[PDB]
Amino acid sequence: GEVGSSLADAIAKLATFLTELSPLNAGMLFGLIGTNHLPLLSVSHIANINPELLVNAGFDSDVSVVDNPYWDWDGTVGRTAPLGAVKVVADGTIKDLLSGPDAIPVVEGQKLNVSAWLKYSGLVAGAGA
């Protein structure tokens, strides 16, 4: 894993790697787990919590803005650490941004709330709708 290492470090790295038979950490699991893979829940475990949905919703990292000339991640502008937000060079045109994580599954009913803190700086955009 690094220049100027030893065979002991090599076998240690191979041991640290997790194969098919080896366990898999449940620490983070970024992304979103589908519904059809959840066979049985727990009624006792059911309770009243409303968590966030999107991953990297605060734009504090490089994810969800990858391969986009219009929008890029910024590590110096942001209210929360590491002060990361989205930057766009609006050259008189239309700009679009989508969530890096895949589809959020919603169904009929099941009301949703959407919020975000936006700030336009140096807006030369025409005063209109």
Binding site: S99, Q110, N113
Partner: protein, 49 residues
Amino acid sequence: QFRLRLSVRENATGGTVWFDDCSVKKAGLLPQGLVDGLVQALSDLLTWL
């Protein structure tokens, strides 16, 4: 399926827009029409009275 669309329309002509603390949350509580026949039973009791 749902995604968060963030669109600056075409009529815009300049500026840089920043976004932070995006939060799309499923809100509410257990819907009435998910428990078994309870809607019908409660309606029947109320209409009986």
